[model samples]
Target: MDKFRVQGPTRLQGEVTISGAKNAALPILFAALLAEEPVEIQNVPKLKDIDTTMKLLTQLGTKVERXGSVWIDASNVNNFSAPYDLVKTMRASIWALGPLVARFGQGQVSLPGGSAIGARPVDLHIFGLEKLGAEIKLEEGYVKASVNGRLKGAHIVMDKVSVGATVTIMSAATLAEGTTIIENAAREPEIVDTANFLVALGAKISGQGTDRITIEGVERLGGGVYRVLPDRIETGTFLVAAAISGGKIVCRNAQPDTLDAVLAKLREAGADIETGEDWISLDMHGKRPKAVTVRTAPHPAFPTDMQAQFTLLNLVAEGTGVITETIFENRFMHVPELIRMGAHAEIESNTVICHGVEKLSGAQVMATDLRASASLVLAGCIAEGTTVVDRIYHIDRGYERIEDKLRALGANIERVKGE
Candidate 1:
């Protein structure tokens, strides 16, 4: 195991480049299975989840090679089953179910496992696939799905807005026989990015970045090169890092438009923020941050992925703030860890009430999930003494050399073997 040993009270000043969106790249990488030719992906971050994806692809007979970027040739795929050993490592493995069935007429994917945030049911995915004429059933721990001939698409109205279901069903629908209309589809930038990647591979898709998306079935898709978008969550994490430390940092290759809600909250907390077409800079010098309440929502709102970092901000602000997590049930697992570091926070149901403190005293903390690990790192960047964050494998699943990036930004952070 690896842990992060962080020496705090250091002000970050420098520019850090944001990596490609993991949320976007995963689906785009899985979409390669739908094409018959080679797909070249640029800006693919080197992370543990990506390694898992490549390994899974290879198991399915796809030739994946990594140089500067990633080149996946899924034209020679011979297997349609994703076993438990690979699928249980990451929940995103379920994304392969749709593509495998669509391209090979059958798919057997084991039930996925990831962070214990909440009960994320795959019922919506199954329902959408069933609507697309896929005969799906749960046998033992795996989902067995098969379709005769080509799939026929139909209108699908999701019971709730789910990003995973939308991406999976949309990818599967690309090879269907008729048109597919996804109502109340996810409007996240990652969704739009995946749609763009699919379109670049010769998919006919429209109405992305909206609640309703329309996709016309194509006979076959050819591979091409596509670039993944900059990670909005990573950009927001760095911004929160700067704000929590009262530092000045510039994030390059970050799309400011994708972070409107986060920027607004940071500005309201008295941080000076500047944005351009491709970059965002945050400076919090000689200004005390005021606490602000936030409620996590879907796209165009305060993202749930950012709630943990913002809660860290509230831990040392000038006033009390309330954070309501409307997304995941157990996302506040970091609150207890933050409490061990001498912060005052209490959770009542889905809301956390944070009382302001001047500073946090360092302690050995454990990270429970991906975003929680980021929050612990942000807290370590400003704590009075040294803070050691354990279970950093969660962080490695999403971030690409995060400690190196933070060190470049002037943080005293290092990765070391855990005891």
Candidate 2:
């Protein structure tokens, strides 16, 4: 419902404290339903998706109090169904299916709407739940599931490594009757963060940051204090913003280790990068970067989440380059938006071949997805003229006050609210 008007060719300079990982926070907050006592989730970010998470959680009778940090108490949870009204835009509600089924013997959540960028299947989620012996069915556009009693654990080998299935099944496994071994699990930092929170709540979990995870079910979980991980995708986006527009910036509260693959790519592009224990400093002052090829894959490699921002960097580089996205279908929907802004690129199979141009003359663009919107903003920051990005609700779903954050770093960006 809101749009952004940005004046371009401005260098971003300053420090920004990265927010909590949206990918991690969404699922973990739902996993908090397993705890009987009040679970204090620290470093929670304020975003549209978070509000959607709160709406679903509170409707199901969990007492959730938010003040930048989140406190969810499931002591009096009543409802087992997350209706479409509450779960419509947040497919992360799929996470609620496991927690409710495990704690209440039943759970029902609406089937998420189709994606603008790709097909996100809930089949793996059903597959993992079925492996845990839950009775699952799809009726009236909602996934309805129930178990006879306490869930009994078994060995689950995923057909595909999915972060959604990994977190969903792992949380349900936390309160199961026996040991649950998950093979071919997603090894993203967010997965590790979720496991750490579960461990703090007194669950027995091993081999978190790997392909195999073993969860030994505990009787019941109580509330504990746990902090979410810093957002690696947001951190990478800011790094690209600074690199493309030619400036010096520092990202605080960031874990450099979580972004090794992305950092390597920036270094190859001739950007100056340095990392400390909790910060990453980048300076690309006045240097036009060299074009570099990038391939997006699972974690410990380049992530598809950061693919759009990196494409912006490559668009302004010194030579031609290509980017291959292996994780999702039709993720290059942003390519045409970028081209509409005078970018020279085309989609070849699953790869994008973009040639460096002297300058981009900004034009009106509409955002297609969460990551795609962020890329458009980055393009606006480096383009020759003013750029206006419409349909920015997509950006608000995950990013927290992006215009405010960019303005803090001296970019002339404003939010135009209304019809």
Candidate 3:
């Protein structure tokens, strides 16, 4: 178990680059399994989840190389079974189900049970697969399915806009025999980026970044090279770091349209922001941090991923700030930890209310989840004295070189490895 120890109230300055989107990279990597030739993916983030996914791919006989992100050669994969050992560790392991069934005509994937969040059902995933001419059945906690000949595509309307479901269905439909129309698809930038990668790899896809997406399936996809999109959540996290720590930092390699709602919220909080095509600079030094109400929704809205970081902002705002998390029911777990650090926050159902505090004193805190770990680090960077954050494996799962990156931005943070 590694922990992050930070001596803070330090000003985080300079520029930090955002890595490739993890949400985009995972599906893209799994989609590589659909190709019969080698597909090179550039700009993949180096994180725990990616590593886990790569290991899962390797177990299925894919040769994965790592120069910076990952270079996957999934053309010779023979295994089609995903055991519970790997699938239980990462819910994203279920992504392999689509590519396996697409290329191999059948797949056996153990269902991802649950995490610290709410009941994230794969019902949407199963429904989309069923629409794509797959006879799916659940038995003994495993999803057993065999697709119809070449998986003839059909119209699929998602009942709830889910990112994972959208990506999974698209990957399955990319090799379908006919056109697949995905109505009410997730409009997140990552979804569009995934579609772009699939299209670049010889799948005919259109109407990305909108409610409806049309994918005209090809008989088989030829291997091609593609670069993943920069992570907007990581960019937004760094921006919130500046705001919560009263620092000025610039985040590079960020897409402007991907963070419209977040930028608006940061601006409303009186943050000094400068936007560009591929970068965003946030200056929150000497600015009055105003309280703002926020509700998490689907794409084109405030993301639930940023909920914890925004709660950190609420701890130091001038007035009361209310945050409503609609995506995950148990997302307010960070509020109790923030309270331990001297912030006054109360959680009610899916909403959290925070009262501004003069200062937060350093305290020993432990993280229970990924976003919760990030929120702890954000609070640690600004607390007086030193804050020790334990159970940082959650943070490592998503953030790449977090300690080094934060240190480069002038935060006095260090990684303490356990003996």
Candidate 4:
């Protein structure tokens, strides 16, 4: 297994550029299926999840090229079915089902299973497709969908505020026959980013970044170039890094509005933070940060994905910090690993109580999930001596060149190949 070896107690003090949002890029890549012509996505981050999506698309007949960013020429593809093996690997793989069904009149995709995070169901996707005149069914583990002609838009009120479903339904509605009104929609900035990209690609979508979204169906969407939004979670990670290490660093290309809730929490923890239009800088020298209580919620709140990293930050703070993960039930998988690294933490159901320590000593740790892996990186950066973090593929799934980014910011970290 690939591992990251890090020697720490290093203070980062430089400017690092944040990459494009991984969550935003995943749906945008799936949106490429809507356009039969070439779609060029600029500012696309090079991540493992992106590579996995590209590979899945390639297996399903979409030709994807990585020229700096992703230059996907999906013009030669006509298959609308997402295979079980691919879709089961990542739940985001099911996003292709919507665009495929809308553009090609039929789509057969596997029902995505649960992940380490939560039981995120795609029932909203299926319900939205069914409302839009598509015949939807679950056969074995596959979700088979067929539309007679072009899908006719209808009003849809999602039972839950799901970002994936909102993106999937909007992608399909872009190619439907009439205007589709989606109520109780997810209001994440990434959702708005996806809608903005679709609009740039000649689709008429309005009222993004709000609970209600309206998509007017277009006959066909033309290919175009679009840049993804900056990663808010990456920006938050850097803030946590600076706070835990008593470092001063500026993160370029960061969207502060997308991370308002997170920033507020960090600010309350005694970290000096400043934000510009697209940049956020954190200075935490000589200030003993106090652990602040946090609860993970939907967008406009502390994200569950950042929970583990924040927990690591809390471990290095001055007092007890309580993190209530309201989003995912099984997210504290890193608690035991953090404790192994000389941190004091105890998990109680959906919440974890973190008691800060003066310092942490290095130890070999294993990562289980994407965010948990990132938490290990954060912990390793502030620990004394050398820390070896195994199972780094989970880290690669979301972060783009993380070791390089951290190194550029003055971290003692390196990616070590298997022996």
Off by over 4 Å in 2: 112-120
| Index of the highest-lDDT prediction | 1
Q: How does candidate 2 fare on TM-score?
A: 0.95
Question: How does each model score on lDDT?
Answer: 0.90, 0.88, 0.86, 0.86
Give lDDT tens digits, candidate 3, residues 1-419.
Answer: 89999887876788999999898998899888987888889999888788888888998989998875578787789889888887777778778888888888998888754444343567788778888988898875689778867888889988788888999898889998889999999999989998998888889999888999998988788787898999888888898888876778889888878999999999999899999988999998766478889999988889989998898898888899999999888878778888988999888888999898868888999868788888898788888999999999888888887888888998899889972
Tens-place lDDT per residue, model 1, 1-419, is 99999988777778999999989999999989998999999999988788899999999999999864899999999999999998787888888989988888999889854455343577788889999999998855778888999878889998799999999889999999989999999999999999999999999999989999999999999999998999999999999888887789899999999999999999988899999989999999855578999999999899999999999999889999999999888789889999999899989999999997988888899867889888998789888899999989889888988999999988899899866
TM-score of 4: 0.93
Better of 1 and 4 by TM-score: 1
lDDT of 3 at 180: 94
Error of 3 at 240 (Å): 0.9
Q: Assess candidate 3 and give its lDDT.
A: 0.86
If both were scored by lDDT, which would come out higher, candidate 1 or candidate 2?
Answer: 1
What does the lDDT come to for candidate 4?
0.86
Worst 10 residues of 3 by lDDT: 112-121
What TM-score number comes out for model 1? 0.95
Record all residue pairs in model 2 with backbone atoms less than 3 Å apart, i.e. clashing: none
User: Relative to the unseen true structure, what is the C-alpha lDDT of residue 256 in candidate 1, on a scale of 0 to 100?
Assistant: 95
